[PDB]
Design a protein around this ligand. Structure first.
Ligand SMILES: O=c1ccn([C@@H]2O[C@H](COP(=O)(O)O)[C@@H](O)[C@H]2O)c(=O)[nH]1
Ligand SMILES: O=c1ccn([C@@H]2O[C@H](COP(=O)(O)O)[C@@H](O)[C@H]2O)c(=O)[nH]1
Lengths: 316, 315
């Protein structure tokens, strides 16, 4: 029951390859607190009723207290940050094949944000939903082990994004752990959504080949080593939604490779043929990430539904 | 006072370009809390006597309790924090800057980030140049919060960046429009892992190796954000083993700030042919020494050892 397995059954369960993004910023938080207050803590009282919130590991005592009597403190931010996350998850989780949290949004406040991240992952883990920590990690072997522990041991995440520009061997200490054997899954950065994400990814080359291809190439040869596949794990690729051209090629010369693709909502895309279409397969190997487009929309569940039906409205 | 004048005056005040790296691991934190236990402390007790211990801002309650814990819960936080203080006090006298690699402070969860905050806070008081090896990278909108974490929360003087996703990334890291503030950074040019050539060397444009193009873009961005004119900068990270490359970059980018790790622990001390192959008005050629000083039974000794070798060479 490695990641590969866990993905497959969630796919049948909901028939969709939608990856909901959970990158809450200071605005979402302070805003969530505002309206929630002038609505008599609607969504939060609704949170407190959900099942798994009872199995939280960090400051459950506080998270479970009634709203108002939290103005009776320095724990306030923590309270609303966490509840906002539980809220979006509760409101959209049934439409998502997986969930991807970007590490960067949980560290700008120090400790407090990691406690939230930790609970967030303990929540999805109980909900038994596939997770992806978008932490685009990278460093030397020795150091990398630390990212591996945090991600796969502490947060019990199912996968994480990785940047191998520094070298492919680094994966040896990210997707594998000798001491316990254990094999983990990761997504390498191939084609990113940065407007200028071509200066190095397209403009750089080797044997007429564009860097992103050599990079995808290597990433795989490393997967063969470690025999992740044999252990139901894999090393997929992050392919920007607006890289139609490049998207189709990866899918072709890498038939059964797992692809993660962000960029349609808040970065202007074309769902139809911005993935899914370009880069089809028994999907799930083509994850469509949408975050801000959903997390900032005033009717999250609605927005979610919308993209769900929409994405699914593509049976070819 | 910008990171260039700060880095410049300290360099003159202790004449050295050594950069002690503080990357404590789970073992170092075990060997430490095992010696203070079989030795009535003394190192922790010394830390508690220090002048700037009360400038730390997180969990000072427990951080200041003479040992003997009771709160077994915060036993790990306690010792982890004091090990860091231990080394800092033990070795700042020979340091031009300190480099803390984020990787080592996140594996236990928030507990470690509390310790990172205290470390940077503590160092801020000693007014010692700081670096956060986080090699951050993502899109403009995300990276923004890395900036808030590194430069507002920790108040670090600089951090490391993996530009591969796009140089533009640097506009939302090295510069905050809403505060008209600037910050310095070190960009991954030539790393020290064995298979570092596959991409940094074997990739190119018109026969220019990637690290060369990365170096360039990194620099073209510095001028566009006018960092140099605001006492900040964008330098390059160049592994101590990259002898050739080290010379090329120093030559075609003569006044650039260079950060080079790799001597000592890994690949074994290059042999300061590295500091020579990259000389300048030292501070531009920062030499990082981590485990060779942290893993050593005599940190202060290990420290002035490297300080002295370097001292000589710069002649
Ligand atoms: O090339 C990439 C790789 C990853 N992401 C991630 O996608 C998430 C945003 O999704 P959205 O809010 O734009 O829909 C961000 O957290 C970011 O880290 C990108 O936007 N572009
Ligand atoms: O290419 C690089 C980039 C960074 N580091 C940093 O060097 C530190 C280790 O120094 P040392 O303990 O090996 O002396 C690590 O934290 C790592 O982040 C390298 O070794 N090589």
């Amino acid at each position: 029951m490695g990641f590969k397995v866990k993905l497959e059954k969630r796919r049948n369960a909901i028939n969709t390859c939608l990856c909901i993004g959970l990158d809450p910023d200071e605005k979402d938080i302070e805003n969530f607190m505002k309206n929630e207050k002038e609505n008599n803590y609607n969504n939060i009282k609704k949170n407190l009723k959900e099942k798994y919130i009872n199995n939280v590991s960090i400051k459950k005592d506080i998270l479970l207290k009634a709203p108002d009597n939290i103005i009776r403190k320095s724990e306030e931010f923590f309270y609303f940050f966490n509840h906002f996350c539980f809220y979006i998850i509760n409101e959209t989780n049934k439409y998502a094949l997986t969930f991807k949290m970007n590490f960067a949004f949980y560290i700008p406040y120090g400790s407090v944000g990691i406690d939230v991240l930790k609970n967030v992952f303990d929540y999805l883990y109980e909900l038994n939903i596939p997770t992806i920590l978008d932490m685009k990690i990278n460093d030397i072997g020795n150091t990398v082990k630390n990212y591996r522990k945090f991600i796969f041991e502490y947060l019990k995440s199912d996968s994480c994004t990785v940047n191998i520009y520094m070298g492919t061997n680094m994966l040896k200490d990210i997707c594998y752990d000798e001491e316990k054997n254990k094999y983990y899954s990761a997504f390498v950065l191939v084609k990113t959504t940065n407007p200028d994400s071509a200066i190095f990814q397209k403009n750089l080359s080797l044997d007429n080949k564009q860097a992103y291809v050599i990079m995808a190439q290597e990433a795989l040869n490393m997967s063969s080593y470690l025999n992740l596949e044999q252990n139901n794990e894999f090393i997929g690729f992050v392919v920007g939604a607006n890289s139609y051209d490049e998207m189709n090629y990866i899918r072709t010369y890498f038939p059964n490779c797992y692809i993660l693709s962000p960029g349609i909502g808040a970065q202007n895309g074309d769902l139809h043929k911005t993935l899914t279409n370009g880069y089809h397969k028994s999907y799930e190997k083509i994850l469509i990430n949408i975050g801000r487009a959903i997390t900032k929309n005033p009717y999250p569940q609605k927005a979610a539904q919308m993209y769900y039906d929409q994405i699914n409205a593509i049976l070819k």
